């Protein structure tokens, strides 16, 4: 539900990123990460929680690189 919308938003983030639309990609990454953090906050299972952290960390790493690039300008 919340993970379905996170997937939708993150697919757009990756698409915008591949098109070099950096400010737009960054917002979609932030928004998708927010939703994934909301799913994580509501999850009790340790494997699911740990796997969700890996997914979030991977998207966070990409968005931190985009922000660093935009900040240089």
């Amino acid at each position: 539900p919340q993970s379905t919308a996170a997937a939708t938003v993150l697919k757009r983030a990756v698409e915008l990123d591949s098109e070099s639309r950096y400010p737009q990609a960054l917002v979609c990454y932030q928004e998708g990460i927010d939703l994934l953090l909301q799913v994580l906050k509501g999850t009790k299972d340790n494997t699911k929680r740990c796997n969700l952290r890996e997914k979030i960390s991977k998207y966070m790493d990409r968005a931190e690189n985009i922000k660093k690039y935009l900040d240089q300008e």
Binding site: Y29, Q30, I33, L37, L40, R49, I56, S57, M60, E64
Partner: peptide
């Protein structure tokens, strides 16, 4: 864990 990632998200939005 959630706090570290939420801090990373807030810094991203600064």
């Amino acid at each position: 864990m959630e706090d570290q990632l939420s801090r990373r998200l807030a810094a991203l939005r600064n």
